[PDB]
Design a protein around this motif. Structure first.
Motif, PDB file in Angstrom:
ATOM      1  N   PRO A   1      40.321  34.456  35.631  1.00 37.31           N
ATOM      2  CA  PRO A   1      39.309  35.588  35.982  1.00 37.31           C
ATOM      3  C   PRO A   1      39.181  35.652  37.198  1.00 37.31           C
ATOM      4  O   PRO A   1      39.187  34.661  38.319  1.00 37.31           O
ATOM      5  CB  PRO A   1      37.861  35.311  35.567  1.00 37.31           C
ATOM      6  N   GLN A   2      39.307  36.849  37.993  1.00 42.32           N
ATOM      7  CA  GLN A   2      38.883  37.127  39.380  1.00 42.32           C
ATOM      8  C   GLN A   2      37.441  38.055  39.374  1.00 42.32           C
ATOM      9  O   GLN A   2      37.268  38.908  38.699  1.00 42.32           O
ATOM     10  CB  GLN A   2      39.708  38.173  39.902  1.00 42.32           C
ATOM     11  N   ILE A   3      36.698  37.210  39.907  1.00 37.62           N
ATOM     12  CA  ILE A   3      35.462  37.885  39.979  1.00 37.62           C
ATOM     13  C   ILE A   3      35.219  38.452  41.676  1.00 37.62           C
ATOM     14  O   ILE A   3      35.290  37.389  42.601  1.00 37.62           O
ATOM     15  CB  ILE A   3      34.136  36.733  40.041  1.00 37.62           C
TER      16      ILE A   3
ATOM     17  N   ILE B   1      36.212  23.599  37.377  1.00 38.78           N
ATOM     18  CA  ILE B   1      36.871  24.501  36.651  1.00 38.78           C
ATOM     19  C   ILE B   1      38.121  25.460  37.545  1.00 38.78           C
ATOM     20  O   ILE B   1      38.437  26.377  37.021  1.00 38.78           O
ATOM     21  CB  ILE B   1      35.793  25.551  36.313  1.00 38.78           C
ATOM     22  N   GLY B   2      38.205  24.887  38.615  1.00 40.33           N
ATOM     23  CA  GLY B   2      39.493  25.141  39.580  1.00 40.33           C
ATOM     24  C   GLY B   2      39.388  26.523  40.107  1.00 40.33           C
ATOM     25  O   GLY B   2      40.171  27.387  40.409  1.00 40.33           O
ATOM     26  N   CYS B   3      38.028  26.770  40.624  1.00 39.88           N
ATOM     27  CA  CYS B   3      37.606  27.927  41.309  1.00 39.88           C
ATOM     28  C   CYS B   3      37.788  27.773  42.737  1.00 39.88           C
ATOM     29  O   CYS B   3      37.506  26.914  43.315  1.00 39.88           O
ATOM     30  CB  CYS B   3      35.986  27.938  41.203  1.00 39.88           C
ATOM     31  N   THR B   4      38.525  28.830  43.184  1.00 44.68           N
ATOM     32  CA  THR B   4      38.711  29.223  44.526  1.00 44.68           C
ATOM     33  C   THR B   4      38.129  30.334  45.055  1.00 44.68           C
ATOM     34  O   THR B   4      37.941  31.098  44.410  1.00 44.68           O
ATOM     35  CB  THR B   4      40.551  29.004  44.702  1.00 44.68           C
TER      36      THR B   4
ATOM     37  N   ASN C   1      39.411  33.479  47.642  1.00 43.29           N
ATOM     38  CA  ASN C   1      40.632  34.171  48.157  1.00 43.29           C
ATOM     39  C   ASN C   1      40.413  35.434  48.786  1.00 43.29           C
ATOM     40  O   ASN C   1      39.482  36.157  48.634  1.00 43.29           O
ATOM     41  CB  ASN C   1      41.469  34.267  46.738  1.00 43.29           C
TER      42      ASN C   1
ATOM     43  N   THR D   1      40.100  25.778  48.435  1.00 47.64           N
ATOM     44  CA  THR D   1      39.455  25.086  47.382  1.00 47.64           C
ATOM     45  C   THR D   1      38.290  24.850  48.074  1.00 47.64           C
ATOM     46  O   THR D   1      37.850  24.845  49.093  1.00 47.64           O
ATOM     47  CB  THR D   1      40.337  24.061  47.269  1.00 47.64           C
TER      48      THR D   1
ATOM     49  N   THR E   1      37.157  36.981  47.086  1.00 47.55           N
ATOM     50  CA  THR E   1      37.137  37.064  45.662  1.00 47.55           C
ATOM     51  C   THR E   1      36.880  35.644  45.224  1.00 47.55           C
ATOM     52  O   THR E   1      37.369  34.785  45.979  1.00 47.55           O
ATOM     53  CB  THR E   1      37.911  37.827  44.828  1.00 47.55           C
ATOM     54  N   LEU E   2      36.415  35.384  44.381  1.00 46.96           N
ATOM     55  CA  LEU E   2      36.417  34.105  43.421  1.00 46.96           C
ATOM     56  C   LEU E   2      37.397  34.258  42.369  1.00 46.96           C
ATOM     57  O   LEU E   2      37.389  35.156  41.587  1.00 46.96           O
ATOM     58  CB  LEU E   2      35.084  33.703  42.797  1.00 46.96           C
ATOM     59  N   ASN E   3      38.161  32.917  42.416  1.00 49.71           N
ATOM     60  CA  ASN E   3      39.282  33.130  41.278  1.00 49.71           C
ATOM     61  C   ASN E   3      39.355  31.559  40.274  1.00 49.71           C
ATOM     62  O   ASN E   3      39.112  30.532  41.128  1.00 49.71           O
ATOM     63  CB  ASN E   3      40.547  33.473  41.657  1.00 49.71           C
ATOM     64  N   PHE E   4      39.430  31.666  39.165  1.00 49.37           N
ATOM     65  CA  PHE E   4      39.766  30.596  38.428  1.00 49.37           C
ATOM     66  C   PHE E   4      40.360  31.105  37.034  1.00 49.37           C
ATOM     67  O   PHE E   4      40.757  31.889  37.003  1.00 49.37           O
ATOM     68  CB  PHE E   4      38.484  29.651  38.028  1.00 49.37           C
TER      69      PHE E   4
END
Ligand SMILES: COC(=O)N[C@H](C(=O)NCCCC[C@@H](CO)N(CC(C)C)S(=O)(=O)c1ccc(CN)cc1)C(c1ccccc1)c1ccccc1
Lengths: 99, 99
Positions: A1-3, A93-96, A98, B4, B96-99
């Motif tokens: 997902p992108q948020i 949960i691997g959240c970055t 970007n 990260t 943005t946030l991404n996972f």
């Protein structure tokens, strides 16, 4: 997902069958949840914010599902109006971020 | 960049030709920087958070360069544990946030 960050990044979390709404919070070192009974030993901790510090209860190795992703780690419970998911679980949960 | 969260997402910002470190914080609606003199009119403002309510000075339409990306937006100056880049500017730089 992108948020995106046009609005508060709120997501669904589940912990021990309680379903709650939480903020994905890259600023927070730790995860701070609204008042709730969790099982197990806890110890007092102090966590700082913009206004000063609040006292919380630190619980270790707590499973939390965040958007279907399984996390297990430290959860701080105290007087917050908003559940915040901090880096300690965001990393799992691997959240970055970007841009 | 992609950043990260195993460490605090601290980046260098440039404001008024001053270099500072600030935290990329999806949990903050607003951008709050430690005490500093910015030019132009400011409005007194009170903001609340974990800990309590603090007085800040609100500066509007301030250019700030975040990790090389240009924003022009509202900056709050006051007593914060750390310089905080909030969503008002994070959205400007395409974060943005991404996972
Ligand atoms: C033991 O180590 C720490 O205390 N770490 C601090 C920490 O992780 N605190 C968690 C508190 C919550 C953080 C913050 C959002 O990221 N809080 C909001 C949240 C409760 C909805 S907040 O601080 O309350 C807050 C409220 C309002 C605004 C702007 N309007 C900005 C920030 C952290 C920090 C992060 C962000 C803001 C303030 C503190 C920190 C403290 C000291 C130095 C560096 C980082």
């Amino acid at each position: 997902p992108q948020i995106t960050l046009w609005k508060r990044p709120l997501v669904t979390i589940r912990i021990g069958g309680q379903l709650k709404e939480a903020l994905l919070d890259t600023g927070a070192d730790d995860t701070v949840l609204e008042e709730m009974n969790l099982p197990g030993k806890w110890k007092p901790k102090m966590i700082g914010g913009i206004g000063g510090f609040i006292k919380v209860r630190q619980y270790d190795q707590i499973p939390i599902e965040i958007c279907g992703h399984k996390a297990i780690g430290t959860v701080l419970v105290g007087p917050t109006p908003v559940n915040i998911i901090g880096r300690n679980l965001l990393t799992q949960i691997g959240c970055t971020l970007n841009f």
